[PDB]
Design an enzyme around this catalytic site. Structure first.
Site, PDB file in Angstrom:
ATOM      1  N   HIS A   1       0.865  -1.172   0.000  1.00 10.21           N
ATOM      2  CA  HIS A   1       0.000   0.000   0.000  1.00 10.21           C
ATOM      3  C   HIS A   1       0.905   1.226   0.000  1.00 10.21           C
ATOM      4  CE1 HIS A   1      -2.647   3.130   1.664  1.00 10.21           C
ATOM      5  NE2 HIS A   1      -3.660   2.401   1.224  1.00 10.21           N
TER       6      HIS A   1
ATOM      7  N   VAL B   1       2.835   3.932   2.151  1.00 11.44           N
ATOM      8  CA  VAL B   1       2.165   4.862   3.053  1.00 11.44           C
ATOM      9  C   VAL B   1       1.195   4.076   3.923  1.00 11.44           C
ATOM     10  CG1 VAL B   1       0.544   5.422   1.192  1.00 11.44           C
ATOM     11  CG2 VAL B   1       0.721   6.914   3.214  1.00 11.44           C
TER      12      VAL B   1
ATOM     13  N   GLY C   1      -4.721   5.070   5.835  1.00 13.94           N
ATOM     14  CA  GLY C   1      -5.475   5.867   6.790  1.00 13.94           C
ATOM     15  C   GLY C   1      -6.526   5.053   7.516  1.00 13.94           C
ATOM     16  N   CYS C   2      -7.126   4.074   6.827  1.00  9.98           N
ATOM     17  CA  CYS C   2      -8.163   3.267   7.455  1.00  9.98           C
ATOM     18  C   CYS C   2      -7.636   2.512   8.671  1.00  9.98           C
ATOM     19  CB  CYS C   2      -8.794   2.303   6.440  1.00  9.98           C
ATOM     20  SG  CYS C   2      -7.712   0.927   5.949  1.00  9.98           S
TER      21      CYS C   2
ATOM     22  N   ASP D   1      -8.876   2.727  12.318  1.00  7.93           N
ATOM     23  CA  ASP D   1      -9.230   1.554  13.107  1.00  7.93           C
ATOM     24  C   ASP D   1      -8.533   1.548  14.462  1.00  7.93           C
ATOM     25  OD1 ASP D   1     -10.983  -0.803  12.741  1.00  7.93           O
ATOM     26  OD2 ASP D   1      -9.202  -1.795  13.529  1.00  7.93           O
TER      27      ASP D   1
END
Lengths: 174, 173
Positions: free
Chosen positions: B72, B78, B81-82, B86
């Site tokens: 990713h 990077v 963001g998820c 979480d």
């Protein structure tokens, strides 16, 4: 430099080619590779369909018991993380931005409101994603805005409003 | 009846939580690797925080070998963001068990989330700050909080109205 492979559906190898920066050409946004890729196929891409007449993406993920997230989330209580279904929606908005010709690296920028009203168990067959693009901006930045939903075997379980993704040529100072 | 109640937790404790052994049977579980998104919880308080209803401080050390960087995205590492989002949900759920709540944790939603930066493999440390807004003690225990994520001193993610529930039975969820 002419864009290649623009069509209305994509298979899993196409998604892998996106993750490797090969599907549309060079310099287009990339889907994640496994184990962050959260779809097996895109069954529909349209620039003019959907609730807002500005774009529709339909995609799906086959649910099989080997998927890594079930064992660790959580031991004795397997459930697909909602954040990964949310990410699938961000992934699809970014994919649309490249599919309509946008170039650069994708970065999710946020979401307005997300509600999870159900869950994805290993016994499910299919998770489906429906992305209704609201609009794409190219004025200064390249940004896509959409609403999305996630269904498990036909039952709506996640709803996200105002998914936002941007494309960036240079992320060094992002 | 509650064991291991203290104001900080190490990685071994987080693994014990994922196995349901830190607080015991019936308490919510953190995820195990590779979904576990922190190394340590440096502060748990029931009384501190922006709303005086709870504060959680937690940290993730950054190395280039963390599994998500390679995939990713290939050639453009990077942290998703998820996964930082979480981590915030995980911490709200952890607080609910820490104060004695029983049941399986499920994230229920979030209000506005803004990403204004990123986590690169060259970063040193991600810090999570959760300011609990409300703990609703019904059959379904609910926690509401605002949270933010910083990397090496820079605020990068801000989530309002993180919502998590503790379920006595998830079979019909």
């Amino acid at each position: 430099n002419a864009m290649q492979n623009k069509r209305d559906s994509y298979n899993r190898e196409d998604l892998l080619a996106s993750s490797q920066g090969e599907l549309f050409g060079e310099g287009y946004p990339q889907l994640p590779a496994p184990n962050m890729l959260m779809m097996d196929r895109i069954t529909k891409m349209s620039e003019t369909e959907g609730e807002f007449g500005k774009g529709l993406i339909l995609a799906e993920l086959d649910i099989t018991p080997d998927l890594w997230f079930f064992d660790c989330h959580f031991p004795g209580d397997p459930v697909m993380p909602g954040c990964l279904g949310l990410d699938a929606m961000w992934q699809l908005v970014g994919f649309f931005l490249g599919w309509v010709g946008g170039k650069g690296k994708g970065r999710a920028l946020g979401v307005g409101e997300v509600k999870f009203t159900g869950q994805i168990l290993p016994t499910a067959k299919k998770v489906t994603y429906e992305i209704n693009m609201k609009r794409v901006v190219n004025r200064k930045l390249v940004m896509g805005l959409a609403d999305g939903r996630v269904l498990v075997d036909g039952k709506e379980i996640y709803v996200a409003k105002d998914l936002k993704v941007g494309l960036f040529q240079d992320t060094s100072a992002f």
